[PDB]
Each structure stands twice: as C-alpha cells, then as structure tokens.
Amino acid sequence: VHRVWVETAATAGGEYLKADLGYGEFPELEPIAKDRLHIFSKPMQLVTEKGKENMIQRGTYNYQYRSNRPVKDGSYLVTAEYQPTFRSKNKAGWKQAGIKEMPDASYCEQTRMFGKNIVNVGAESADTAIITKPVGQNLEIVPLDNPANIHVGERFKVRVLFRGEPLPNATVTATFDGFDTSDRSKTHKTEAQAFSDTTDGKGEVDIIPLRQGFWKASVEYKADFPDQSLCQKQANYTTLTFQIG
Amino acid sequence: VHRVWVETAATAGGEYLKADLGYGEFPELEPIAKDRLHIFSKPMQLVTEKGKENMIQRGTYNYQYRSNRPVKDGSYLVTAEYQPTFRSKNKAGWKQAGIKEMPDASYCEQTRMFGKNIVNVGAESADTAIITKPVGQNLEIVPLDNPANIHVGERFKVRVLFRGEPLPNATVTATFDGFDTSDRSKTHKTEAQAFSDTTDGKGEVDIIPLRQGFWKASVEYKADFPDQSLCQKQANYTTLTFQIG
Numbered sequence: 001v002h003r004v005w006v007e008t009a010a011t012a013g014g015e016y017l018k019a020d021l022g023y024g025e026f027p028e029l030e031p032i033a034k035d036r037l038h039i040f041s042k043p044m045q046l047v048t049e050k051g052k053e054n055m056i057q058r059g060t061y062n063y064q065y066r067s068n069r070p071v072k073d074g075s076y077l078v079t080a081e082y083q084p085t086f087r088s089k090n091k092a093g094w095k096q097a098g099i100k101e102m103p104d105a106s107y108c109e110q111t112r113m114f115g116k117n118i119v120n121v122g123a124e125s126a127d128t129a130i131i132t133k134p135v136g137q138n139l140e141i142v143p144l145d146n147p148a149n150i151h152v153g154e155r156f157k158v159r160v161l162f163r164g165e166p167l168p169n170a171t172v173t174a175t176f177d178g179f180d181t182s183d184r185s186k187t188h189k190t191e192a193q194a195f196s197d198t199t200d201g202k203g204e205v206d207i208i209p210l211r212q213g214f215w216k217a218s219v220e221y222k223a224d225f226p227d228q229s230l231c232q233k234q235a236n237y238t239t240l241t242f243q244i245g
Numbered sequence: 246v247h248r249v250w251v252e253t254a255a256t257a258g259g260e261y262l263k264a265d266l267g268y269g270e271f272p273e274l275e276p277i278a279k280d281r282l283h284i285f286s287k288p289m290q291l292v293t294e295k296g297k298e299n300m301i302q303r304g305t306y307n308y309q310y311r312s313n314r315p316v317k318d319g320s321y322l323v324t325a326e327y328q329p330t331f332r333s334k335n336k337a338g339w340k341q342a343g344i345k346e347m348p349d350a351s352y353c354e355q356t357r358m359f360g361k362n363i364v365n366v367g368a369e370s371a372d373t374a375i376i377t378k379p380v381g382q383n384l385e386i387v388p389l390d391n392p393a394n395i396h397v398g399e400r401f402k403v404r405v406l407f408r409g410e411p412l413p414n415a416t417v418t419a420t421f422d423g424f425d426t427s428d429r430s431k432t433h434k435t436e437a438q439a440f441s442d443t444t445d446g447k448g449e450v451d452i453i454p455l456r457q458g459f460w461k462a463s464v465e466y467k468a469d470f471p472d473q474s475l476c477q478k479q480a481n482y483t484t485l486t487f488q489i490g
Contacts, residue, residue, distance in 0.1 A: 097407065192453055223339075
C-alpha cells in the first residue's frame with residue numbers, strides 16, 4: 001500500500017532546496033492523485049535553526065517543493081505528513097492462515113503517516129543541533145547522529161518516539177534505492193529490506209547500512225485512538241530517509 | 246531470548262559429520278543447561294538420500310553431535326527441534342493501548358522451535374534433491390536452491406511451510422555471524438538482521454545476502470493451538486542456516 005517518504009536533491013549553499021513528497025512505493029515518486037489531494041493539505045516543511053517553515057509547491061508535478069529562499073550550508077530536515085484520515089474496518093473474515101479469528105464488528109481507524117529527510121547542504125556539513133531535535137511527529141524517527149558520519153558497516157543510532165515518548169520493542173527496518181528492483185511492476189512488490197531490528201528500552205536502535213546510497217528506515221505503530229468516544233484505533237507509518245556515503 | 250539454530254563443521258567425503266545444536270543467542274554456542282535438557286529429548290537428525298537418521302550426542306560439550314557413520318560427498322540437511330513446551334501467559338502493558346489488557350485473562354501457549362542447516366560435504370557438492378525436499382517441521386524453511394550457487398547480491402529463494410502448507414505474508418529475516426557484534430547488554434533483544442522481507446502467495450521469498458559468511462534465516466509464526474480443549478496459542482520459531490561464499 002501507499003507510504004510517505006521524502007527525497008531531497010543534492011544541494012549546495014546558495015541554491016534553492018528542492019524536495020519531493022513520496023506517496024506510494026519507495027523509491028518511485030508519483031503525482032498525488034486527484035482523490036488524495038485532501039490528504040496532503042499542508043505543505044512539506046523545512047526545519048532550520050529558525051524552526052519550521054513551509055516549503056513552496058512548485059515544479060512540473062504536484063509532489064515537487066522548493067524552499068522559500070536559497071539555503072546556506074548546514075544540516076536540515078524536510079518533513080511531510082499524511083493528514084489524519086478516518087475509515088471503517090471490520091476484520092469481517094479474511095486473511096487467516098492459522099487462527100480461527102472472526103469477530104464481526106465495524107470500528108473506526110485513524111491513519112497518519114510521516115516522512116523526514118536529513119539533508120546536508122554543503123559537501124562538508126555534518127551538524128547535529130537541528131536534525132537530532134524531535135519535530136513532534138506523532139510517530140517519529142529521531143536521528144542521534146548525522147548520517148554523513150556513518151560509513152558502510154557502522155552504527156547509525158536513531159530513537160523512535162510515540163506521542164513524545166520513546167517507544168520500546170518497535171521494529172525498525174531499512175532499505176536503499178536499488179536494493180530490490182527485480183521484476184518491479186504495479187502488480188509485483190519489491191519490499192525487501194537490508195536491515196531490521198527492534199528498539200531498546202530507551203526507544204533506540206542502531207541501523208547498520210551495508211551499502212552506500214539513498215536509504216529509507218521505516219517504523220509503524222498501531223494503538224488505541226485517544227478519544228474513544230470518537231474513534232477506536234490509530235495506525236501510524238513513519239519513515240526517515242538519508243544518504244550513506 | 247533463546248533460539249534454536251544448527252551449525253555444521255566443514256566436512257569432506259569419508260569423514261564423520263560433526264554438528265552443533267545452538268540454543269541461545271546466535272552465533273554463540275552454549276551448553277544446554279540442566280533445567281533445559283528435557284526440552285531437547287530427541288537428538289538432532291541427519292537427512293540424506295537414505296532419509297532421516299539420528300545423530301549421536303558425543304563430544305566435549307553436550308550440544309555436540311556426530312553422524313553414526315562417515316558420510317560421502319553430497320548435500321544434506323541437519324535438523325534440530327525444541328520439543329513442545331507449555332507456558333502460561335497474560336497480556337498487559339504497552340505504549341498507548343489501554344492499561345486494562347482485559348483484567349488479566351491467562352492463557353496457555355505452546356512453544357516449538359526448529360533448526361535446519363544445509364551442509365555440503367565435498368568442495369564441489371551443490372546438489373538440491375535432498376535439501377529442497379521438506380522434512381516436516383511444524384514451521385519450516387525449505388531452500389529452493391543450494392546456497393553454494395548463490396553469490397553476494399544474488400537471490401536465494403526459500404519457501405515457508407506451516408503445517409505442511411505454504412505460508413503467505415510471513416516475515417523472513419536473515420543475519421550473518423559478524424554482522425552484529427553488540428554484547429549481552431541487550432538481554433531482551435535479538436540480534437540485528439541484515440535482511441527482511443515477506444513471503445508471497447506461494448510462501449516464497451528471495452533472501453538477498455549482502456556479505457559472505459555463515460548466515461541464519463529466521464521466521465516465526467503465532468497461531469491458534471489445534472486442540473482448543475488443551476491449549477489456546479502456539480508460537481513457532483524456525484531457522485535455516487547456510488554458508489554464502
């Protein structure tokens with residue numbers, strides 16, 4: 001199904017920062033369809049020393065964004081958000097494979113998705129003050145180091161936060177653009193991951209990349225919706241994208 | 246978090262096949278503790294063209310096994326089994342679900358674990374007739390090729406069977422000895438994985454190894470116990486170990 005990630009063009013100091021909203025199957029960017037525009041009703045955000053600022057949707061396709069002004073050397077974040085949507089679900093009678101299951105009862109589920117890209121502007125930029133600060137995504141991956149410092153085979157430590165608190169025992173997987181390309185089509189999935197581990201009691205996990213490239217780490221979390229008088233379940237899907245080498 | 250895997254020593258045609266039962270944290274072999282001996286009440290098995298035969302538990306440590314007779318060149322399996330154990334469980338405590346995980350209703354869960362190693366006796370042995378035939382583990386990983394034919398970056402296809410039938414949408418992860426060197430401080434975590442994907446409708450998945458070495462693939466599956474008048478849940482933990490390059 002469709003997930004949210006962010007991609008940024010390589011950017012030097014003094015040029016506009018160009019970013020793409022990915023909604024679909026990594027790493028293929030696709031225009032946001034007519035029936036999905038309402039889900040992305042807020043622009044992607046650029047996070048700098050001054051805080052969060054809206055990016056400007058410009059380009060050929062509606063997933064393309066631009067910083068309002070040219071950016072100087074530094075290490076920044078670009079964030080995207082699938083705004084909360086509600087749907088009915090019922091677990092009616094499907095899937096199975098080993099459990100009897102079945103419990104006819106429709107319920108409301110709220111879906112939220114989040115993307116975050118670490119972008120180093122300038123060939124030697126490896127700052128941490130901005131990128132290691134949580135931005136307040138309901139489910140968030142917070143890097144604890146700058147990925148520019150990470151060589152193949154080394155440990156890239158991240159922290160998973162849920163509702164502001166570290167989330168233990170969450171599965172974080174990671175893959176890179178080009179890892180799984182065989183027979184890719186609209187009907188054939190290429191979801192293979194090059195890394196998987198679970199977070200510790202501090203919500204932390206070390207991603208160990210075995211190849212250079214454009215990486216995406218993923219975590220998901222299903223929980224009860226806060227106000228049970230309005231909705232029952234909440235599903236969160238969050239990514240962190242970054243370059244290795 | 247103790248899991249079952251199998252290791253085999255390098256073996257040439259005409260000598261005895263030496264194998265190790267791993268119960269603990271891959272890849273460190275550990276003596277089977279006194280209070281766990283009853284779980285491994287049946288010896289590891291060697292699978293050849295002749296079928297299954299018991300191996301002989303002999304050596305310095307109680308996890309070491311040896312073939313009854315010397316083995317000739319070929320491609321064989323060595324299997325191990327954690328015999329079914331029952332435990333009481335109760336559900337409680339998670340991030341943002343609901344404190345009341347149903348006022349503590351305890352239930353029985355049966356745990357079973359399985360290990361399988363592909364062993365090529367002879368430097369040019371890469372046969373498939375034996376190793377691709379299922380041996381009947383409740384949850385089983387069946388290789389569809391001999392790993393000796395798989396180079397780094399190529400696809401090693403396997404099939405997951407549960408109760409004799411292909412298991413779709415099962416998560417298969419894989420790691421290798423030396424990938425994750427973090428010490429016994431995780432005490433609740435398993436080792437980091439260098440691969441993760443889900444099985445397709447035929448229960449099949451391509452493992453893509455990014456490094457040479459001694460690899461372990463893992464799948465787990467929790468389902469309803471067959472006879473609900475005795476126990477409620479079943480947890481299965483299965484590994485397949487093999488050499489790449």
